[PDB]
Design a protein around this motif. Structure first.
Motif, PDB file in Angstrom:
ATOM      1  N   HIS A  72      42.765  -8.093 -65.493  1.00  0.00           N
ATOM      2  CA  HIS A  72      42.099  -9.172 -64.775  1.00  0.00           C
ATOM      3  C   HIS A  72      42.106  -8.920 -63.277  1.00  0.00           C
ATOM      4  CE1 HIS A  72      40.859 -13.299 -63.771  1.00  0.00           C
ATOM      5  NE2 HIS A  72      41.811 -13.259 -62.856  1.00  0.00           N
ATOM      6  N   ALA A  73      43.228  -8.432 -62.739  1.00  0.00           N
ATOM      7  CA  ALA A  73      43.275  -8.110 -61.316  1.00  0.00           C
ATOM      8  C   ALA A  73      42.238  -7.050 -60.962  1.00  0.00           C
ATOM      9  CB  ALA A  73      44.678  -7.647 -60.928  1.00  0.00           C
ATOM     10  N   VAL A  74      42.163  -5.984 -61.761  1.00  0.00           N
ATOM     11  CA  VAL A  74      41.215  -4.912 -61.452  1.00  0.00           C
ATOM     12  C   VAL A  74      39.773  -5.403 -61.580  1.00  0.00           C
ATOM     13  CG1 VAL A  74      40.527  -2.559 -61.971  1.00  0.00           C
ATOM     14  CG2 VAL A  74      42.918  -3.220 -62.180  1.00  0.00           C
ATOM     15  N   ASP A  75      39.472  -6.170 -62.634  1.00  0.00           N
ATOM     16  CA  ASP A  75      38.110  -6.659 -62.827  1.00  0.00           C
ATOM     17  C   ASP A  75      37.702  -7.630 -61.726  1.00  0.00           C
ATOM     18  OD1 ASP A  75      37.626  -5.210 -65.248  1.00  0.00           O
ATOM     19  OD2 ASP A  75      38.836  -6.689 -66.327  1.00  0.00           O
ATOM     20  N   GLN A  76      38.621  -8.496 -61.294  1.00  0.00           N
ATOM     21  CA  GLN A  76      38.315  -9.398 -60.191  1.00  0.00           C
ATOM     22  C   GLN A  76      38.120  -8.635 -58.889  1.00  0.00           C
ATOM     23  OE1 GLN A  76      37.087 -12.207 -61.203  1.00  0.00           O
ATOM     24  NE2 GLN A  76      38.559 -13.692 -60.392  1.00  0.00           N
ATOM     25  N   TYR A  77      38.840  -7.525 -58.706  1.00  0.00           N
ATOM     26  CA  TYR A  77      38.547  -6.649 -57.576  1.00  0.00           C
ATOM     27  C   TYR A  77      37.137  -6.081 -57.675  1.00  0.00           C
ATOM     28  CZ  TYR A  77      38.741  -2.576 -54.494  1.00  0.00           C
ATOM     29  OH  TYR A  77      38.474  -1.633 -53.530  1.00  0.00           O
ATOM     30  N   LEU A  78      36.713  -5.696 -58.881  1.00  0.00           N
ATOM     31  CA  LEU A  78      35.387  -5.103 -59.037  1.00  0.00           C
ATOM     32  C   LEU A  78      34.267  -6.127 -58.877  1.00  0.00           C
ATOM     33  CD1 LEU A  78      35.468  -2.302 -61.736  1.00  0.00           C
ATOM     34  CD2 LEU A  78      35.830  -2.238 -59.267  1.00  0.00           C
ATOM     35  N   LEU A  80      34.402  -8.864 -56.919  1.00  0.00           N
ATOM     36  CA  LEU A  80      34.649  -9.676 -55.730  1.00  0.00           C
ATOM     37  C   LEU A  80      33.384 -10.014 -54.947  1.00  0.00           C
ATOM     38  CD1 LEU A  80      37.216 -10.857 -54.255  1.00  0.00           C
ATOM     39  CD2 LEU A  80      37.014  -8.883 -52.746  1.00  0.00           C
ATOM     40  N   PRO A  81      32.479  -9.075 -54.638  1.00  0.00           N
ATOM     41  CA  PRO A  81      31.280  -9.460 -53.872  1.00  0.00           C
ATOM     42  C   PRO A  81      30.396 -10.458 -54.593  1.00  0.00           C
ATOM     43  CG  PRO A  81      31.055  -7.243 -54.729  1.00  0.00           C
ATOM     44  CD  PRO A  81      32.483  -7.630 -54.931  1.00  0.00           C
ATOM     45  N   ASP A  82      30.503 -10.558 -55.917  1.00  0.00           N
ATOM     46  CA  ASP A  82      29.705 -11.505 -56.683  1.00  0.00           C
ATOM     47  C   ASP A  82      30.390 -12.858 -56.844  1.00  0.00           C
ATOM     48  OD1 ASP A  82      27.682  -9.512 -57.187  1.00  0.00           O
ATOM     49  OD2 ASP A  82      29.014  -8.665 -58.710  1.00  0.00           O
ATOM     50  N   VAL A  83      31.717 -12.887 -56.943  1.00  0.00           N
ATOM     51  CA  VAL A  83      32.398 -14.129 -57.306  1.00  0.00           C
ATOM     52  C   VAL A  83      33.050 -14.804 -56.103  1.00  0.00           C
ATOM     53  CG1 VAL A  83      32.792 -13.189 -59.606  1.00  0.00           C
ATOM     54  CG2 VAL A  83      34.619 -13.081 -57.891  1.00  0.00           C
ATOM     55  N   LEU A  85      34.115 -16.244 -52.272  1.00  0.00           N
ATOM     56  CA  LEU A  85      33.551 -17.109 -51.246  1.00  0.00           C
ATOM     57  C   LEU A  85      33.860 -16.629 -49.831  1.00  0.00           C
ATOM     58  CD1 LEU A  85      34.544 -20.580 -52.776  1.00  0.00           C
ATOM     59  CD2 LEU A  85      32.200 -19.792 -52.515  1.00  0.00           C
ATOM     60  N   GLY A  86      34.344 -15.399 -49.667  1.00  0.00           N
ATOM     61  CA  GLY A  86      34.917 -15.013 -48.391  1.00  0.00           C
ATOM     62  C   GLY A  86      34.313 -13.831 -47.660  1.00  0.00           C
ATOM     63  N   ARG A  87      33.246 -13.239 -48.195  1.00  0.00           N
ATOM     64  CA  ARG A  87      32.525 -12.147 -47.536  1.00  0.00           C
ATOM     65  C   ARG A  87      33.484 -11.020 -47.129  1.00  0.00           C
ATOM     66  NH1 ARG A  87      27.271 -11.852 -47.248  1.00  0.00           N
ATOM     67  NH2 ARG A  87      26.356 -11.082 -45.297  1.00  0.00           N
ATOM     68  N   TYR A  88      34.036 -10.378 -48.152  1.00  0.00           N
ATOM     69  CA  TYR A  88      34.970  -9.277 -47.970  1.00  0.00           C
ATOM     70  C   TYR A  88      34.264  -7.944 -48.179  1.00  0.00           C
ATOM     71  CZ  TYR A  88      38.297 -13.090 -48.602  1.00  0.00           C
ATOM     72  OH  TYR A  88      38.987 -14.276 -48.494  1.00  0.00           O
ATOM     73  N   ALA A  89      34.722  -6.930 -47.449  1.00  0.00           N
ATOM     74  CA  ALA A  89      34.168  -5.588 -47.523  1.00  0.00           C
ATOM     75  C   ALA A  89      35.226  -4.610 -48.015  1.00  0.00           C
ATOM     76  CB  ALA A  89      33.631  -5.130 -46.161  1.00  0.00           C
ATOM     77  N   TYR A  90      34.774  -3.586 -48.732  1.00  0.00           N
ATOM     78  CA  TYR A  90      35.661  -2.537 -49.203  1.00  0.00           C
ATOM     79  C   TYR A  90      35.955  -1.548 -48.077  1.00  0.00           C
ATOM     80  CZ  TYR A  90      34.647  -4.310 -53.876  1.00  0.00           C
ATOM     81  OH  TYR A  90      34.522  -5.110 -54.988  1.00  0.00           O
ATOM     82  N   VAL A  91      36.963  -0.709 -48.298  1.00  0.00           N
ATOM     83  CA  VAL A  91      37.418   0.220 -47.272  1.00  0.00           C
ATOM     84  C   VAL A  91      37.222   1.681 -47.659  1.00  0.00           C
ATOM     85  CG1 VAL A  91      39.296   0.694 -45.640  1.00  0.00           C
ATOM     86  CG2 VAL A  91      39.138  -1.534 -46.751  1.00  0.00           C
ATOM     87  N   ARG A  92      37.077   2.002 -48.944  1.00  0.00           N
ATOM     88  CA  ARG A  92      36.967   3.383 -49.411  1.00  0.00           C
ATOM     89  C   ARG A  92      38.140   4.212 -48.891  1.00  0.00           C
ATOM     90  NH1 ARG A  92      32.847   1.279 -52.331  1.00  0.00           N
ATOM     91  NH2 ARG A  92      32.138   0.528 -50.288  1.00  0.00           N
ATOM     92  N   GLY A  93      39.330   3.841 -49.361  1.00  0.00           N
ATOM     93  CA  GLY A  93      40.589   4.319 -48.826  1.00  0.00           C
ATOM     94  C   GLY A  93      40.723   5.807 -48.577  1.00  0.00           C
ATOM     95  N   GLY A  94      41.482   6.156 -47.543  1.00  0.00           N
ATOM     96  CA  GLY A  94      41.770   7.539 -47.223  1.00  0.00           C
ATOM     97  C   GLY A  94      43.204   7.735 -46.779  1.00  0.00           C
ATOM     98  N   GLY A  95      44.074   6.802 -47.145  1.00  0.00           N
ATOM     99  CA  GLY A  95      45.475   6.842 -46.771  1.00  0.00           C
ATOM    100  C   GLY A  95      46.337   7.554 -47.791  1.00  0.00           C
TER     101      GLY A  95
END
Lengths: 439, 439, 439, 439
Positions: A72-78, A80-83, A85-95
């Motif tokens: 559920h955590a992973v699916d809600q991450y996937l 997120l832009p659809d569900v 209310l907070g206009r969040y952007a991904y980072v495409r990690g490189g750390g």
């Protein structure tokens, strides 16, 4: 002659440090409210079956429950832009947790060699944490469902991802919106191997500036900070000069003699300390507002301690009078005996803290740690949270009646001995000083 | 000669003001209970998935949740005459939110130009609230489902409607039923843009008379109010005459001299203030009961302050004796030193309030605002809510150990310094006055 | 000569009254636990969707909810012998609510003539409660589903039935099992006509003896009660004789003179009162245990007051010594001034109670009634429940800032004035008496 | 001469006993946390519909509910290796509850002859518990579903099984993992026959060593315990010698005479007691750690009492000075009068406890037992939990107004009499001793 100029300086100092503290506190409260609301929204979005107030008791108890929570955590991450209310952007990690081109990192952590066979009362374990991670990249608008947890060797499971948002609350107070980056960690901790796996979500916010912050029609704070620095440097300079004169006169009077040793004004020492703290805090605040330093705790502690110290000096102003002077000299007289009785009562208090910890740790919620025991005893001394302690002990009267009787004796003896004797002696000592000063 | 007539008047005054306050309080409690129960019923009817006790934490977290909440509120408004237990009537609004012939107004409020692109760290915003409203008219026994929220630019969503009901509780106490009009506002607030949108329902009641209130077989209150006004005007007149005589004698004695300046009776000043407050409150009460004024707070404050002031005067009656007189003169003697110590302790208290706010705002629930910090410190001084503060700080010991240590030092220093010294000195000062009066 | 015989009697009296009180308390606790558990089981069986802790907030809000609650209660009554765990029997009622041969009575209560039309602001009501009841008879192992509630005119809906059970807890303590009859009342109250209808379940237990109580192999209590009566009658007789001798000597000394008037021993008066209370309570206890009287409150109050009074007399025994005598004479000396200051502080306390009620009734949970206001102020004086009051007021700071400011001033003034001055003066007065007795 | 060697010994004694107590407390806290988490996981696994916080109110109310709870417990026992997160092993019981080759024992307990017919008001019961058990053996990877409960005669239903696990937390602190055996008891108690059957789960852990504990690369505690024993035996020896010298000098001075009788040093007696307690606790700790003794309560009580006693002796060190000596002699002087007033106030306190129990047991949660009444009154005296008591009484003002009025009088009288007089006299007595020592 007449020269109240030095006295004038310190009142303007108190005024400016108070205004600066108020402004900084308002801004920091706004930022902290934003962070806290974002974290609460993150918990509600990513924790399956989460409700407000269930933070310490939120845990998984079955393998199916753990699998469902992770998925559920992973699916809600996937989604997120659809569900969201907070206009969040991904980072495409490189750390470090994320490979080059992955947003979410799902990682187990288990022993390298673990064989637990409780039924033969045998086992062999090599304590060394092996970490295997699955990398998930967000679609811009696959095998994480095949995860196997290795429950017997499992130590913890963590989910790492970051989210970028724009703080739009700063449109109020006429501030330029800030670029926030929230690092989110969801931990499924199995370090106790007790069958109960707590689930927690923690966030760490990294505030930065925004590349193109164009806001329609949009230095006072910086100039006010500079003014505070100037006034505190003048106060420091005058206090240092006064201390130099004091030491010169101390040597001149010592050259005639041929607590008596000290002849220094403690108010000036307090003022010097407050000035140093204020200058350090103001530089730190300028940095924090320039966004090159986060370090919020140290600056706030420095500014608050400095404000408290400068507000102590109004006592110095009141000493110049007579009735206020005798009211403060009563406390000055009473202090030494208060410290001497503090030692005698503190040895007993420490012994009671140790005994209470060692006996009531297994059975009482308020006695788990030494600091908690100290806080419980301190609140008991002042008449707070007594029936809750008694009822917590009573809830286990049927089991370990010996422990219940010992707890009764312990609590009654402590409360009687301290409240009825120690506080009474404190009151008796301070009334004595009042009488001495009136005589 | 013998003339206790003036003394007689003030006891009847105390009696009548007490009875009037009791009657007004009973009526106001009935009305407030009716309003509160109506508001609770409104929340249960119109808030989707609402439970008692979830008022501050009630919020939406997903777009689907927000849509469902809004649609459920509107549908429950449309089905109210069929589902409700309260016999409510529609209003067919004609005010500002509602167009001519609409009962419910659903209104967004969003920025005129809003483009937030966190992923390029760029944005352009024109802060100006654009409002688009959908009007819904109730059937007497369509396109609100097509609403698009514009979540990125959204500021808040509000639902406005009014309900008319008849208060039937007033059949008890033999009152004529009142016509209530409840203005209901449901707010979905997104001013923080944090992904969490709180949902609240507030009501405002407008009480009016009913056009045809015929109740089978159905002035004492008005006449009693008139009597109270008369007695307080007589008391005012006599107190003013006494003050005039006092001033005349002050000039006559000043013409011989050729705190000593004042020769006025403070009891008469207090009586004059109480009389003025009672007359103002009684006129305001007559208005409120005539239904031409709502203004409930001011009248209650005036009446309560007047009742307290008139109940102070029994001390004046007790001063006429001797033992009561010495018991009150002890406090009179002790007051000045109590105020002088209050200033000296208040400067420290203010410094501690500022420091506690600035440091423990981000991490402690009880330290969010300055007034809350002051209340927390005041309760700590008197021995209340200490372990809860300590445990709230302890719940964050693992994170920011520096902040935890500072909080420990701050709390221990404050509690020790104030409880063990300031209160002890207060007790010491007042015992001194007792001894002075017995000598 | 030597005659401690009278002194011996009162110690055995204290012993026997203490043992009797302990035995009666144990039995009454057992019976009360049985009643409370039966009532909780009844709520869980008959209240639809009921959970522990939801007693005051349990209410219905829709017509469908009310219908379902009523129907569920009736159906659970009909299915009780099949679903219940408590072996309950029907009664086939023959009282006032139930016709001859019905177990459950479902009764509406509504106005005779009720027409509420809020939309024309007109209404006509004839206040007179019309009651229509449906009688349900239990099968021994029909039209209640057609009930129409008349919601606009509805006042309340009640369900009446009785249940017979056998108390099997009395097998422990070697008592003969008792025959209980529980009268159960479920009330759906719509007296406020606010759209919210509270639902409550209350029980009244009628304890009787069982016709054929044969328990395998199965007067000490009655004989002990008789012994207590005998000892208290002897104590009464001796105290009365002593008072007669005292009055005789008072007349003999008055015949020579030719607080001084009184020459009576107050300890003997207290002993007489305790003896009378104990005899009355013991007769009442014999009745209660014989099951011809229920009346549990009066007997318990009499026995408890008598036990407290007899435990006061140990002070009389301690006065015979010297150091205890001076310690009690200090309090005797301090009492009058304590009462005189109590009056002066009580007038202020009453004024503050009235003001707090009238102002903070509409907005504060702890200020709804005058007794509640008095309890709140009394707890505030002693340092309890202060932050909760402040936070309850703070939760409404945004609305009615005038009320919030008034509440701040009111609370701060009250707490400061009473805690810092009144209690300090109490301590000062009692220290004065201590000094007087040591001098 | 100079010989501070004996004084040196006791400081090292305090140090070593403190370190030993700290180490033992840390280990015991770890073990208790493991046990508690295992028990919580067991409740969540085996109790149907169980939630955190519902421990005392968790109960069954219908026959279907009871059947489902029992069957769910048994099925979760059977599916434990598949569903659980804790790697538990079966035991294949061979004790008293379990036959030779069964893991779970499901046992009813009911009367031999029970016939309850409430409807004829007749019954015959033979009180004797008949026990019929069903044995379930776990598959290694049948007729329990046919269980009939006999509800009318039922007394209780219990489920017994044991689970073996390996404590892997001890890998931290570098300890060898322990073999735990949890005995789990699930009780469905119907001893009250009130229709409400509470459900509880209790565990008892038996810690043993593991047969083959091979942990990769893995006596300080034992040697430290030996060192503590040695130092406490030396302290005991020196204190005994000092007491022998004291008694010799007592006889030598008595042979000249030809509280005066005693000439013994109480500090040495306290030291001897602490040494004996420490040696006993250390031997018990060595046993507990060797796993041949569990007995955790006695050892902890001994060690804590010994640590408190040794921390009292720092007062003895402080008496060697002068100002500390007078501060301790003030308390020594004040103690006797404090005890004499304690008796006089304790008789009243006991009378109030008895009265409060007997009257407010049926209606107040805090007045159910005598110990609870004593704790409530003690907390009331010190200013804690007053408004909760008042509100608990107020919640029943409508019913038994006589009881409500009596409760008001009782609480007000108790609080006034004790807080305003008894504590004031305590403060007055101790100030007197302070004055005596300063004179």
């Amino acid at each position: 002659g007449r020269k109240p100029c030095k006295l004038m300086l310190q009142v303007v100092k108190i005024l400016v440090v108070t205004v600066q503290l108020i402004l900084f506190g308002l801004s920091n409260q706004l930022a902290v409210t934003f962070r806290e609301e974002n974290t609460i929204a993150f918990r509600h979005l990513f924790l399956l079956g989460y409700s407000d107030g269930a933070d310490d008791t939120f845990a998984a108890y079955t393998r199916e429950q753990l699998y469902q929570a992770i998925f559920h955590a992973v699916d809600q991450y996937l989604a997120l832009p659809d569900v969201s209310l907070g206009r969040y952007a991904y980072v495409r990690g490189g750390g470090d947790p994320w490979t080059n081109g992955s947003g979410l990192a799902l990682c187990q952590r288990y022993y390298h060699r673990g064989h637990v066979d409780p039924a033969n009362d045998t086992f062999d374990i090599d304590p060394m944490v092996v970490t295997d991670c699955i990398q998930v990249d967000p679609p811009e608008r696959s095998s994480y469902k095949n995860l196997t947890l290795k429950f017997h060797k499992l130590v913890n499971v963590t989910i790492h991802f970051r989210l970028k948002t724009i703080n739009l609350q700063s449109l109020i107070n006429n501030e330029i919106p800030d670029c926030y980056t929230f690092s989110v960690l969801i931990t499924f901790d199995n370090k106790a191997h007790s069958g109960r796996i707590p689930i927690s979500l923690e966030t760490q916010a990294h505030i930065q500036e925004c590349k193109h912050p164009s806001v329609f029609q949009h230095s006072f704070r910086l100039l006010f900070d500079v003014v505070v620095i100037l006034t505190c440097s003048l106060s420091f300079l005058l206090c240092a000069r006064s201390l130099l004169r004091g030491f010169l006169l101390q040597n001149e009077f010592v050259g005639f003699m041929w607590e008596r040793l000290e002849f220094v004004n403690g108010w000036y020492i307090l003022l010097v300390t407050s000035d140093v703290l204020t200058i350090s805090g103001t530089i730190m605040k300028i940095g924090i507002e320039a966004k090159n330093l986060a370090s919020y705790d140290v600056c706030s502690i420095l500014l608050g301690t400095s404000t408290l110290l400068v507000w102590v000096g109004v006592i110095r102003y009141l000493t110049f009078f007579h009735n206020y002077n005798i009211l403060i000299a009563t406390l000055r007289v009473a202090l030494p005996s208060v410290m001497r009785f503090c030692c005698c009562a503190g040895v007993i208090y420490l012994g009671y803290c140790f005994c209470g910890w060692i006996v009531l740790g297994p059975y009482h919620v308020k006695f788990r740690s030494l600091s908690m025991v100290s806080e419980c005893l301190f609140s008991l001394i002042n008449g707070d949270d007594m029936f809750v302690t008694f009822a917590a002990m009573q809830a286990q009267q049927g089991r370990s009646s010996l422990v219940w009787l010992f707890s009764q004796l312990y609590l009654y003896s402590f409360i009687s001995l301290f409240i009825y004797m120690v506080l009474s002696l404190f009151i008796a000592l301070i009334t004595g000083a009042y009488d001495t000063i009136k005589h």
